[PDB]
Short mmCIF file of C-alpha atoms in Angstrom, two decimals:
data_model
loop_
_atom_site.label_atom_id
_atom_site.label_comp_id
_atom_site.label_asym_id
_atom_site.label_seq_id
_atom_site.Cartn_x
_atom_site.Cartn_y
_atom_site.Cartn_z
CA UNK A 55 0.00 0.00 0.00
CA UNK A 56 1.02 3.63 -0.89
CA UNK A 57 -1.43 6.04 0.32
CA UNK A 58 -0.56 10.29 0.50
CA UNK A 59 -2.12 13.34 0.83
CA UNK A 60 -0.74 16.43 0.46
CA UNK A 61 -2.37 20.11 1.03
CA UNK A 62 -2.14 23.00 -1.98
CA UNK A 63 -3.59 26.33 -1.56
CA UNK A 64 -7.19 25.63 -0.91
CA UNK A 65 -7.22 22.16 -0.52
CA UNK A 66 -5.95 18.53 -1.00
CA UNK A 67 -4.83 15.50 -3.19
CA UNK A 68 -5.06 11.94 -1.72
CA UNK A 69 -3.75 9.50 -3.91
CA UNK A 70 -2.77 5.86 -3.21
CA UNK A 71 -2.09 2.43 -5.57
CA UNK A 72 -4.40 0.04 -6.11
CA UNK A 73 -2.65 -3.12 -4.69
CA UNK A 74 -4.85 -5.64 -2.01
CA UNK A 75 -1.92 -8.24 -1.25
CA UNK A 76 -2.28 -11.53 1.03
CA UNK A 77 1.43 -11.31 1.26
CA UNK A 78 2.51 -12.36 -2.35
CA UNK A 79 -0.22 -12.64 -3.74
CA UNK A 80 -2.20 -9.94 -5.32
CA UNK A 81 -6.40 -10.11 -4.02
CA UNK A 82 -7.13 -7.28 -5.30
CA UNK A 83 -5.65 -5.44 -8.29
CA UNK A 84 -8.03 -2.49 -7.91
CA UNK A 85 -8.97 -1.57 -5.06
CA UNK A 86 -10.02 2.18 -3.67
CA UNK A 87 -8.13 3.31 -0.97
CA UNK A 88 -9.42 6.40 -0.80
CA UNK A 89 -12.51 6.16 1.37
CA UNK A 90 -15.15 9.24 1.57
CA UNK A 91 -16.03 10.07 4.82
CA UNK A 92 -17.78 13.08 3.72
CA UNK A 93 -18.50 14.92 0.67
CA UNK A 94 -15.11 16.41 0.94
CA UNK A 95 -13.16 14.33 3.60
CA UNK A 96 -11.48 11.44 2.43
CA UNK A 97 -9.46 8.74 4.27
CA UNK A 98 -7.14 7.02 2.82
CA UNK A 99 -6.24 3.68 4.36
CA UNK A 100 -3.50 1.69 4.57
CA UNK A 101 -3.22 -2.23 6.78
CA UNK A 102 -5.85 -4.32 7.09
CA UNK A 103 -8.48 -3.89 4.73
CA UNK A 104 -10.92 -5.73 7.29
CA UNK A 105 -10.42 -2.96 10.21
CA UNK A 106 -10.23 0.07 8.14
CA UNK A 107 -13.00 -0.24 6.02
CA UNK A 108 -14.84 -0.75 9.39
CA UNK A 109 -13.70 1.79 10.65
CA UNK A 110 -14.23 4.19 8.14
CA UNK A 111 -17.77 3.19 7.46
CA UNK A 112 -18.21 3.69 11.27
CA UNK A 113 -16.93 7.21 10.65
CA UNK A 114 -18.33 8.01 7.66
CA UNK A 115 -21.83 6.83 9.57
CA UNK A 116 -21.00 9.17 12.62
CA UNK A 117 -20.24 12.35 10.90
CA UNK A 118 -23.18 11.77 8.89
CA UNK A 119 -25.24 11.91 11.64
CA UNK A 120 -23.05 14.53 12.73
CA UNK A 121 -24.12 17.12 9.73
CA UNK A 122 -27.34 16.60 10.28
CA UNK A 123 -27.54 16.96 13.23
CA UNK A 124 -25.81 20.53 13.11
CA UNK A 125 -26.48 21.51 9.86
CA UNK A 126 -23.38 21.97 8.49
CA UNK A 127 -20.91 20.88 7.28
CA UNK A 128 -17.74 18.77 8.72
CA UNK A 129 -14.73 20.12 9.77
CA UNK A 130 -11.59 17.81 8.65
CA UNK A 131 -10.68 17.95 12.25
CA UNK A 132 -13.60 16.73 13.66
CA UNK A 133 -13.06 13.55 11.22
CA UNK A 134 -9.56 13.12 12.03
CA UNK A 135 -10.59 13.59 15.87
CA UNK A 136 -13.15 10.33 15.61
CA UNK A 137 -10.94 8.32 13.52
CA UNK A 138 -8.28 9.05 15.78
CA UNK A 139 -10.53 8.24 18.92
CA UNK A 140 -11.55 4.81 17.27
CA UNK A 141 -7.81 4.09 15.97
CA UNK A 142 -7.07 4.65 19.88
CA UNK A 143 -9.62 2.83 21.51
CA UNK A 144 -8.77 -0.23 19.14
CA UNK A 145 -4.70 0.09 18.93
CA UNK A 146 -4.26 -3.36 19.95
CA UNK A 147 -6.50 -5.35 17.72
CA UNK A 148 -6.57 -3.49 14.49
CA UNK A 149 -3.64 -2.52 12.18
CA UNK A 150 -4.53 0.76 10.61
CA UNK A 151 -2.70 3.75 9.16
CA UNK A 152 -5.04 6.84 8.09
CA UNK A 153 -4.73 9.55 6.95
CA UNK A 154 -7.69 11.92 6.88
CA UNK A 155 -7.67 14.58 4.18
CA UNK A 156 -10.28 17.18 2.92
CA UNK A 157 -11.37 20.71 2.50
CA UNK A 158 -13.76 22.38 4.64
CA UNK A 159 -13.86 26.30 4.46
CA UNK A 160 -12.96 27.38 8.04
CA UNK A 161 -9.65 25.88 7.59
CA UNK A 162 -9.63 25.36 4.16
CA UNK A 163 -7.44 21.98 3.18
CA UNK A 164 -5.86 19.76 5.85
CA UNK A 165 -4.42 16.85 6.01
CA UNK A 166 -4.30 14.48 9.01
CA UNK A 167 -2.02 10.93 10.11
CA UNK A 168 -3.00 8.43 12.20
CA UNK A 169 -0.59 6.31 12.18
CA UNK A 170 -0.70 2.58 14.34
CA UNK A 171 -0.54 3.84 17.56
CA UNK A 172 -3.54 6.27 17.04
CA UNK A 173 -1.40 9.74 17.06
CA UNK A 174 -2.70 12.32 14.91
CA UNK A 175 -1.02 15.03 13.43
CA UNK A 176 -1.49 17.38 11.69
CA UNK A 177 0.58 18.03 8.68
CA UNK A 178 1.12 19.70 5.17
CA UNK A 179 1.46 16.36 3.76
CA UNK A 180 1.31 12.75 4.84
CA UNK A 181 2.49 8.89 3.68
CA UNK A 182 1.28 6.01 4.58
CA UNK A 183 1.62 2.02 3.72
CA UNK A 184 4.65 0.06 3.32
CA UNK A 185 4.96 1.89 0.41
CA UNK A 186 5.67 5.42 2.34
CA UNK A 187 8.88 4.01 3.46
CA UNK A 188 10.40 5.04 -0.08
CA UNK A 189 8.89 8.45 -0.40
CA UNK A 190 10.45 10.52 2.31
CA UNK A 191 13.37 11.19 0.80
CA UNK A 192 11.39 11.79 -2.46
CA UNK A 193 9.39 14.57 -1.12
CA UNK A 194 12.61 15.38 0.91
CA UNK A 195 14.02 15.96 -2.15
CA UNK A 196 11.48 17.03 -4.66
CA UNK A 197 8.68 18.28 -3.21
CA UNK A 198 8.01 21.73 -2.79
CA UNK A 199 5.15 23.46 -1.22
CA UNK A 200 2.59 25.79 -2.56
CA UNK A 201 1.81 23.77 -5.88
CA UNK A 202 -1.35 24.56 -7.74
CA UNK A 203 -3.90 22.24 -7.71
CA UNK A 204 -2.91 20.10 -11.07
CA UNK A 205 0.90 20.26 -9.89
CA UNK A 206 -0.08 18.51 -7.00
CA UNK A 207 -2.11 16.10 -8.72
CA UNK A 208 0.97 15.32 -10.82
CA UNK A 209 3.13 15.29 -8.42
CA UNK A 210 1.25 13.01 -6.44
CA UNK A 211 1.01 10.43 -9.28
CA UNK A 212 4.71 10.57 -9.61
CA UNK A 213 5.16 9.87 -6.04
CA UNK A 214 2.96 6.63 -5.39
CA UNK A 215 4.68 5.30 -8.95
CA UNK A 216 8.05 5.67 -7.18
CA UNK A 217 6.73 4.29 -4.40
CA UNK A 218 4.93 1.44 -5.93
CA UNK A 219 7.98 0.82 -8.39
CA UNK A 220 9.57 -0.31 -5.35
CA UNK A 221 7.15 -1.58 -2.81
CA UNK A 222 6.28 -5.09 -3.96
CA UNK A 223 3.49 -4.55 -1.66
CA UNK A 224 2.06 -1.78 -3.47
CA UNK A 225 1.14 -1.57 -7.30
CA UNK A 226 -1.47 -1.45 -10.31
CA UNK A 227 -3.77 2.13 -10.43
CA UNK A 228 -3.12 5.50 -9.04
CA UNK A 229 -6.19 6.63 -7.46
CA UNK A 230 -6.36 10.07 -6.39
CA UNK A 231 -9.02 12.65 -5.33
CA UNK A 232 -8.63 16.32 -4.89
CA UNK A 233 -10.76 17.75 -2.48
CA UNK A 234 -11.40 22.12 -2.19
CA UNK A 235 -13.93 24.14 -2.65
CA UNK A 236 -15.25 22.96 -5.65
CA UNK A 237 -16.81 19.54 -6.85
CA UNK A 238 -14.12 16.84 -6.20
CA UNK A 239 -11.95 15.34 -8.79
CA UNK A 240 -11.39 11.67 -8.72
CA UNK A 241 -8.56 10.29 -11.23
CA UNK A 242 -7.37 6.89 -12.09
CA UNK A 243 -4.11 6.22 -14.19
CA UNK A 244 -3.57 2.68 -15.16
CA UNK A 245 -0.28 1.11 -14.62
CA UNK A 246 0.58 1.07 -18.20
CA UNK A 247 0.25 5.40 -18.15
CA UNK A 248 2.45 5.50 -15.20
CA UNK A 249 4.80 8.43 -14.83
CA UNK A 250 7.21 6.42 -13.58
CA UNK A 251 8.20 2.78 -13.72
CA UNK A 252 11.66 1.11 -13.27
CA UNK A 253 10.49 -1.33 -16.54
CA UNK A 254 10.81 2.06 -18.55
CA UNK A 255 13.12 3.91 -17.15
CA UNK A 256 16.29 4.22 -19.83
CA UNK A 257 18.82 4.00 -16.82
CA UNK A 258 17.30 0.20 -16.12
CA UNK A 259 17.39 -0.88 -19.70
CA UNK A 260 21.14 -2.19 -19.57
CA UNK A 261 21.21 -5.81 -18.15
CA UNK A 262 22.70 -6.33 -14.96
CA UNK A 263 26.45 -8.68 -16.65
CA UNK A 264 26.14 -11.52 -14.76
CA UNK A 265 26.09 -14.20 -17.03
CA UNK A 266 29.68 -13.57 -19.02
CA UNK A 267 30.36 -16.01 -21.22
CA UNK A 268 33.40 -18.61 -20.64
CA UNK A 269 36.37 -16.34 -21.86
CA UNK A 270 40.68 -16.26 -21.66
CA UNK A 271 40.05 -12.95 -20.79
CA UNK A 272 39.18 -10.87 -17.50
CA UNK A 273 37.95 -8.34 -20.00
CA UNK A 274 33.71 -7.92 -19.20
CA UNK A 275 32.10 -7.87 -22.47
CA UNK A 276 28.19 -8.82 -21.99
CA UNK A 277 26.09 -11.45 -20.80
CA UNK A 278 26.07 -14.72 -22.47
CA UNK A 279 23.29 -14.42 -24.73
CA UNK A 280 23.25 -17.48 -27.39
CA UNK A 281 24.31 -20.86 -26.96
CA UNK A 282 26.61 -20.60 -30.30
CA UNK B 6 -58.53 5.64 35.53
CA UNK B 7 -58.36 5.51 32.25
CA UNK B 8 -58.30 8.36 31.52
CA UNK B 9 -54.40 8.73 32.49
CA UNK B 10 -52.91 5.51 31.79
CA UNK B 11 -52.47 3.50 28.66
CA UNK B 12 -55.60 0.76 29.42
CA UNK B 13 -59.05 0.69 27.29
CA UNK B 14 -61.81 2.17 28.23
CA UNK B 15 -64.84 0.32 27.74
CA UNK B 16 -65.66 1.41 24.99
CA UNK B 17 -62.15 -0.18 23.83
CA UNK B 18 -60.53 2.90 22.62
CA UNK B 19 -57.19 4.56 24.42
CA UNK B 20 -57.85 7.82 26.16
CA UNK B 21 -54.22 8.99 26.30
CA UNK B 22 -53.79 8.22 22.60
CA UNK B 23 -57.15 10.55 21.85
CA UNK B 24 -55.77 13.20 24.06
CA UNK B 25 -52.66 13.19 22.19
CA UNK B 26 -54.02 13.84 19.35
CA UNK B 27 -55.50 17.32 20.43
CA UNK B 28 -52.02 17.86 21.36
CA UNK B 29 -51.45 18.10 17.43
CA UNK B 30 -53.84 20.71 17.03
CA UNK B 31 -53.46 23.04 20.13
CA UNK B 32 -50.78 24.93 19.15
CA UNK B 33 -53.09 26.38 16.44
CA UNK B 34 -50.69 25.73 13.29
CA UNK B 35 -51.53 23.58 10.01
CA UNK B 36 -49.51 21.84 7.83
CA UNK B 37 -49.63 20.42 4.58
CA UNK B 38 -48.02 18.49 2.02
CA UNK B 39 -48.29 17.23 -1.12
CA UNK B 40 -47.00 15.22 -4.28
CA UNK B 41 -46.64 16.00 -7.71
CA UNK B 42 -45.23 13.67 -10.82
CA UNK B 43 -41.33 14.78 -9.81
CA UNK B 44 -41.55 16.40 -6.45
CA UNK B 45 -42.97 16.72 -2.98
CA UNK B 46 -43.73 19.59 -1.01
CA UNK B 47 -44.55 20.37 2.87
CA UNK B 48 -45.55 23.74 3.59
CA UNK B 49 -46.04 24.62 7.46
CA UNK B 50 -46.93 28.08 8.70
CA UNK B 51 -44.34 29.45 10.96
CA UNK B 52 -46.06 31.60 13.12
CA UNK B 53 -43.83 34.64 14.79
CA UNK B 54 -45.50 36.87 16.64
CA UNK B 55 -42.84 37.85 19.45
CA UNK B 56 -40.87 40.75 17.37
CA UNK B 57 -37.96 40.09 19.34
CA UNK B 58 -38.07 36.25 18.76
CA UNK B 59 -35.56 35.26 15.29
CA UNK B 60 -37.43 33.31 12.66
CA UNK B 61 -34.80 31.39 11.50
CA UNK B 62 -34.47 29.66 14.88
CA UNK B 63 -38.12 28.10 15.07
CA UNK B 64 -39.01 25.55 12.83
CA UNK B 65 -41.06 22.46 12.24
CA UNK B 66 -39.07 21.04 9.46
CA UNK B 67 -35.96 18.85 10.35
CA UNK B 68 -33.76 17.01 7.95
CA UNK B 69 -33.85 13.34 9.14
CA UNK B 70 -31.43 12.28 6.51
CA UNK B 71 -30.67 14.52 3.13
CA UNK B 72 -32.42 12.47 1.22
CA UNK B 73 -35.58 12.35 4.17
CA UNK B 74 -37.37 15.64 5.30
CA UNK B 75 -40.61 15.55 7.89
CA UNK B 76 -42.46 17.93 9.22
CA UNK B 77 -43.69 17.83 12.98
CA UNK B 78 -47.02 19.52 14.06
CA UNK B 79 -47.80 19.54 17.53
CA UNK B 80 -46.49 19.90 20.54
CA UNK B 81 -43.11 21.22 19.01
CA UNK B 82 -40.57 19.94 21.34
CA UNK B 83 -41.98 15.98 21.40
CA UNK B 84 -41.59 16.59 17.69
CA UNK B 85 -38.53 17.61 18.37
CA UNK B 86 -37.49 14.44 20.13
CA UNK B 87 -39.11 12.21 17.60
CA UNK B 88 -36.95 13.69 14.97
CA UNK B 89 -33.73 12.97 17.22
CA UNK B 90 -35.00 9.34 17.50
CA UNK B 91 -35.94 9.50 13.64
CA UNK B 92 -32.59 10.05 12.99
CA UNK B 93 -31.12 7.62 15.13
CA UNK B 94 -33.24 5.32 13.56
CA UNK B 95 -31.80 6.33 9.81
CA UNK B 96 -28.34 6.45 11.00
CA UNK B 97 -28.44 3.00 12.53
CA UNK B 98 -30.20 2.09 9.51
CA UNK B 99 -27.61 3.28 7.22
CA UNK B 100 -24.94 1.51 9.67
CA UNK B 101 -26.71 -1.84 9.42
CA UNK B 102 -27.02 -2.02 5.92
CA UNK B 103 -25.10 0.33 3.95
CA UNK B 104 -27.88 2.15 2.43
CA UNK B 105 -30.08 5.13 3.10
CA UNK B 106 -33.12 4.19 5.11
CA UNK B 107 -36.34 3.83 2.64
CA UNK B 108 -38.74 6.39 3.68
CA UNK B 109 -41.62 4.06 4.15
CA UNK B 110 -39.94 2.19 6.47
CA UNK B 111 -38.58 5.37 8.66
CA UNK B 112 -42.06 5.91 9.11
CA UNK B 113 -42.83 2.31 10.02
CA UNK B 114 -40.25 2.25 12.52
CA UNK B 115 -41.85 5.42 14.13
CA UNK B 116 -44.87 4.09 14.24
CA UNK B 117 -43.49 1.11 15.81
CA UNK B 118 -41.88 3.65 18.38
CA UNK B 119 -45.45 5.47 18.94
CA UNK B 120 -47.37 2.28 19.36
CA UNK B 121 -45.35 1.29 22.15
CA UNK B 122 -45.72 4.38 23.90
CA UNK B 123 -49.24 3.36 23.64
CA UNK B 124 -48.90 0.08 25.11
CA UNK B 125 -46.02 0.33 27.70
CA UNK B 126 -47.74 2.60 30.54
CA UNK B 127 -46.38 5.92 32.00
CA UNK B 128 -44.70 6.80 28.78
CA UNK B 129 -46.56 10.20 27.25
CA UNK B 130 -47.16 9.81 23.70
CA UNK B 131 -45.96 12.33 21.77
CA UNK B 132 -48.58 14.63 20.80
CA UNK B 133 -47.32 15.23 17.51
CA UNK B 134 -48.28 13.86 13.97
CA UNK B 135 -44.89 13.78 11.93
CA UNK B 136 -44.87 14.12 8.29
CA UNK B 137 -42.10 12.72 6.37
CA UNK B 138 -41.37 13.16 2.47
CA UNK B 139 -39.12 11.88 0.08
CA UNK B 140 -37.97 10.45 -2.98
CA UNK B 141 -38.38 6.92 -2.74
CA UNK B 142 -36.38 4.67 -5.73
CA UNK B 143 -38.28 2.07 -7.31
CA UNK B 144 -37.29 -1.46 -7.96
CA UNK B 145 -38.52 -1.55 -12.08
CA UNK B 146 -37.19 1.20 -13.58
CA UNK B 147 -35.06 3.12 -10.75
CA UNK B 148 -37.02 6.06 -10.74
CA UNK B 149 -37.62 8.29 -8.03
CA UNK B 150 -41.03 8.54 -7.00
CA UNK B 151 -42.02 11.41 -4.28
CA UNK B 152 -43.30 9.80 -1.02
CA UNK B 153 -45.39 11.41 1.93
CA UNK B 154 -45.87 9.42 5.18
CA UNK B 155 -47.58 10.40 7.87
CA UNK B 156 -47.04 8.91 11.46
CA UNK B 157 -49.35 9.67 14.55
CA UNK B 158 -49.17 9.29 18.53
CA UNK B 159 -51.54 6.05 17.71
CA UNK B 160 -48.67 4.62 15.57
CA UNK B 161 -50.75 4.79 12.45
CA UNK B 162 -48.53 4.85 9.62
CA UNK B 163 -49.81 6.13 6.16
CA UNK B 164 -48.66 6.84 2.84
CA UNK B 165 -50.63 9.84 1.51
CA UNK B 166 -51.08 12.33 -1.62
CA UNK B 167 -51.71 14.60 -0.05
CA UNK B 168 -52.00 15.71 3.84
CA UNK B 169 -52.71 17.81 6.44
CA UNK B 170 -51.91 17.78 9.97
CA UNK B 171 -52.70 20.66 12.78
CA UNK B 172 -55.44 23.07 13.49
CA UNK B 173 -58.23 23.11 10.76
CA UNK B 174 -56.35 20.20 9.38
CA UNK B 175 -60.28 19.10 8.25
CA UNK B 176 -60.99 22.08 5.74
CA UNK B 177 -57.60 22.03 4.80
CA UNK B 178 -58.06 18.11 4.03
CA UNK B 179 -61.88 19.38 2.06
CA UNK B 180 -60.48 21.51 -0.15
CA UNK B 181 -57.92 18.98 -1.49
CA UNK B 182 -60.08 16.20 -1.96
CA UNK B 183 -62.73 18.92 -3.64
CA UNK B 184 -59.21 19.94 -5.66
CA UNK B 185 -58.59 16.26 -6.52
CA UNK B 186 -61.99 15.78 -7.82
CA UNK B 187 -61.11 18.25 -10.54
CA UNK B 188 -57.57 17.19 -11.34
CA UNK B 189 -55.06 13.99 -11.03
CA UNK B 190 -52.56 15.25 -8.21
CA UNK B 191 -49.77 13.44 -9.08
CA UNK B 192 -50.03 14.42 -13.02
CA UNK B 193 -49.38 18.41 -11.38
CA UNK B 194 -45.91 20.30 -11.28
CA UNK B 195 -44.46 21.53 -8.53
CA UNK B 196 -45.75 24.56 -9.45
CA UNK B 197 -49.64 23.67 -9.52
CA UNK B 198 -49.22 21.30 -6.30
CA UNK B 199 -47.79 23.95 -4.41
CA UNK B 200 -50.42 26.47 -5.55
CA UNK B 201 -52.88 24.14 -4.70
CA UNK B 202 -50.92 23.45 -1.01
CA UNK B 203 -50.92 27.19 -0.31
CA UNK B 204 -54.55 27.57 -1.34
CA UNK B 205 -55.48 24.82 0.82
CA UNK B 206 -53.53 26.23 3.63
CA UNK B 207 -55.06 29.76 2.85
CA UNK B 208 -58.90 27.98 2.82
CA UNK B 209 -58.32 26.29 6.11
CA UNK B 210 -56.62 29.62 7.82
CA UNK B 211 -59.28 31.52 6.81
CA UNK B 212 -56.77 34.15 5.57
CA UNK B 213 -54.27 34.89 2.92
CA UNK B 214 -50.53 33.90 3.74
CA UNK B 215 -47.04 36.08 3.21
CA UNK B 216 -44.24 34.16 2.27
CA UNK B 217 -42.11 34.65 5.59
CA UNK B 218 -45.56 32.78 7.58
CA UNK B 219 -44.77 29.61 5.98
CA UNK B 220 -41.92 27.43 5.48
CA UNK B 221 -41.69 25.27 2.25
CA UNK B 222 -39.71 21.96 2.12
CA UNK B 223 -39.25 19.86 -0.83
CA UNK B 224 -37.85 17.38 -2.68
CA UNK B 225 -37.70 16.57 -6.18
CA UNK B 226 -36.49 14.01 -8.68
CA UNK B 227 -33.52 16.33 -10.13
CA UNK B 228 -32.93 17.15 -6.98
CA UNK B 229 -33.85 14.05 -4.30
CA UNK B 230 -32.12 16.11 -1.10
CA UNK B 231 -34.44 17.39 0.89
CA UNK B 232 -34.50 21.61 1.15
CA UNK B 233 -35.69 24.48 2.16
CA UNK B 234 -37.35 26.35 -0.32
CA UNK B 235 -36.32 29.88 -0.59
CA UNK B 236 -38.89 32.42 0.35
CA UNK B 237 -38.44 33.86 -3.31
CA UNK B 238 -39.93 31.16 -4.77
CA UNK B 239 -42.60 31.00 -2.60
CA UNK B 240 -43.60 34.51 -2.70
CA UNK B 241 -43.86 33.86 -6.73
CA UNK B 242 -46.23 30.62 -6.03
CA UNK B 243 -48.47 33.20 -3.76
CA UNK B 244 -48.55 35.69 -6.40
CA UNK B 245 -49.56 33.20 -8.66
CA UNK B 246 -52.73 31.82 -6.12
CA UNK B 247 -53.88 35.30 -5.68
CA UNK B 248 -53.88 35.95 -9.49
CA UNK B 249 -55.80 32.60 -10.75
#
């Protein structure tokens, strides 16, 4: 799993790959990590599939009942405040990483992680999944704050197909969502329009030479390719 | 004896139950609500006679879900606290089985909630008669067809046309069924039902209506959420009931 967020002026991208994996094997090859809580509030979520799909329907049922009852709309605090409550209450039996992302206009976009233990903080951006592991130092080195919208979106893309070029536990779409004042944006590229793979990138092209053929020379020439 | 508890009389009716019914129309206010091919409307009057009171704090229409508005006539907090356990109902509804509670059976499970009140003694019914609408998706084509259901403190759940609940909610109720000898109610537009709602409210009220003395909630095909309608809109509907 890959799943980000990241904030731009007047709201937020989520974005995540569409791996499921039982280890090895890949369940699901499309699945939707990104999980509306409201209109504009996503989560996105990252271990088990069982736990955080309950607990973001549980969520998703609260703040309902929530705007309603108010009538307004939802802060993305007070959905990161519940999810974090429920990732709390339940640290020991669920594995869960969230992050809890939207656009509501008091605060405009935010972006929230809840990592395993149930912490949650506040950020400009967030990672989550296995996949996260290879990003830091990709945002540490390439992203910069205060991208436009469609930037962001790009950006985004580029950084789960890094991640999930890597991550065997990660792979297939990129899903994202931006979330602002407007209507919200879902996208979906398909592996075979990623903006970045390692099976296309000219600097992985050259085979590893580990195959030389049987010379009289130390001299490394190629791999053996041909019997002949 | 009883007259105060929830036991027959002899004449094998439920005194309490009776009683809580006048409780619907003592606060003097009628309601009334109606379908049309693509929409339904509830109009209530929203009486404001303190100058000093704000009008957009008082109000007897409640969301119960977006896609589920009702109306509550009576005594206005008990409608108040049906509405909370309306929405309790939807929302453990929606919980249970990952889709938006069916109007009809909202109203069902209210009037299971009344009923008991009418069985269990030393629990007041609420003297209110709750009036839900909505869109309501059918099973052929998937088509939204508007939806009015009544509940009331008996439990009695109906689906209706058109309704009316609250004081003079009899020559309100007259002049639609004389208005739906004439035409077929749910062949109108929203525009001619809600004429014909105002009218019927105007009859019964014995006066003529301003927009800001009602409040107008709807819901329509194109648009299934349920909403207040703007007092704009229904200043142009009184114009055109005063006209023809």
């Amino acid at each position: 799993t890959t799943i980000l967020a990241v904030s731009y002026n007047g709201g937020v991208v989520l974005a995540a790959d569409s791996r499921t994996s039982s280890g090895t094997y890949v369940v699901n090859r499309a699945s939707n990590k990104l999980t509306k809580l409201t209109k504009k509030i996503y989560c996105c979520r990252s271990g088990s599939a069982a736990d955080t799909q309950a607990l973001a329907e549980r969520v998703s049922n609260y703040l309902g009942s929530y705007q309603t009852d108010i009538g307004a709309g939802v802060n993305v605090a007070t959905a990161a405040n519940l999810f974090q409550k429920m990732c709390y209450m339940n640290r020991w039996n669920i594995s869960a990483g969230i992050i809890v992302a939207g656009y509501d206009p008091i605060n405009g976009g935010s972006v929230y992680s809840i990592p395993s233990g149930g912490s949650c903080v506040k950020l400009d951006y967030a990672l989550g999944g296995s996949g996260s592991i290879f990003l830091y130092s990709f945002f540490d080195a390439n992203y910069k704050p205060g991208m436009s919208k469609s930037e962001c979106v790009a950006f985004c893309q580029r950084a789960v197909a890094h991640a999930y070029s890597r991550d065997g536990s990660s792979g297939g779409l990129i899903r994202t969502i931006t979330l602002d004042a407007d209507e919200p944006e879902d996208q979906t590229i398909p592996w075979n329009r990623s903006p970045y793979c390692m099976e296309k990138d000219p600097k992985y092209v050259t085979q590893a030479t580990q195959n030389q053929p049987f010379s009289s020379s130390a001299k490394i020439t190629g791999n053996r390719m041909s019997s002949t | 004896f009883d007259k105060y508890i929830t036991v027959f009389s002899p004449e094998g009716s439920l005194y309490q139950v009776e009683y809580a019914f006048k409780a619907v129309t003592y606060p003097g206010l009628l309601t009334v609500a109606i379908r049309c091919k693509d929409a339904v409307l509830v109009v209530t009057q929203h009486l404001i006679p303190d100058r000093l009171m704000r009008p957009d704090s008082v109000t007897a229409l409640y969301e119960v879900t977006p896609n589920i508005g009702c109306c509550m006539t009576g005594r206005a907090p008990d409608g108040r606290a049906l509405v909370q356990r309306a929405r309790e109902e939807a929302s453990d509804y929606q919980y249970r089985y990952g889709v938006e509670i069916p109007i009809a059976v909202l109203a069902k499970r209210m009037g299971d909630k009344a009923q008991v009140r009418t069985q269990q003694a030393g629990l007041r019914p609420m003297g209110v008669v709750s009036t839900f609408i909505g869109m309501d998706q059918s099973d052929q084509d998937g088509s939204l067809k508007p939806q009015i259901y009544t509940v009331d403190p008996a439990g009695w759940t109906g689906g209706h046309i058109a309704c009316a609940a609250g004081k003079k909610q009899v020559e309100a109720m007259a002049f639609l069924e004389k208005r739906q000898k004439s035409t077929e109610l749910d062949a109108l537009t929203q525009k001619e039902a809600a004429m014909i709602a105002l009218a019927a409210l105007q009859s019964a009220i014995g006066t003529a209506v301003k927009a800001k003395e009602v409040e107008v909630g709807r819901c329509t095909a194109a648009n299934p959420a349920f909403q207040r309608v703007p007092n704009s809109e229904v200043e142009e509907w009184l114009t055109a009931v005063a006209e023809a």
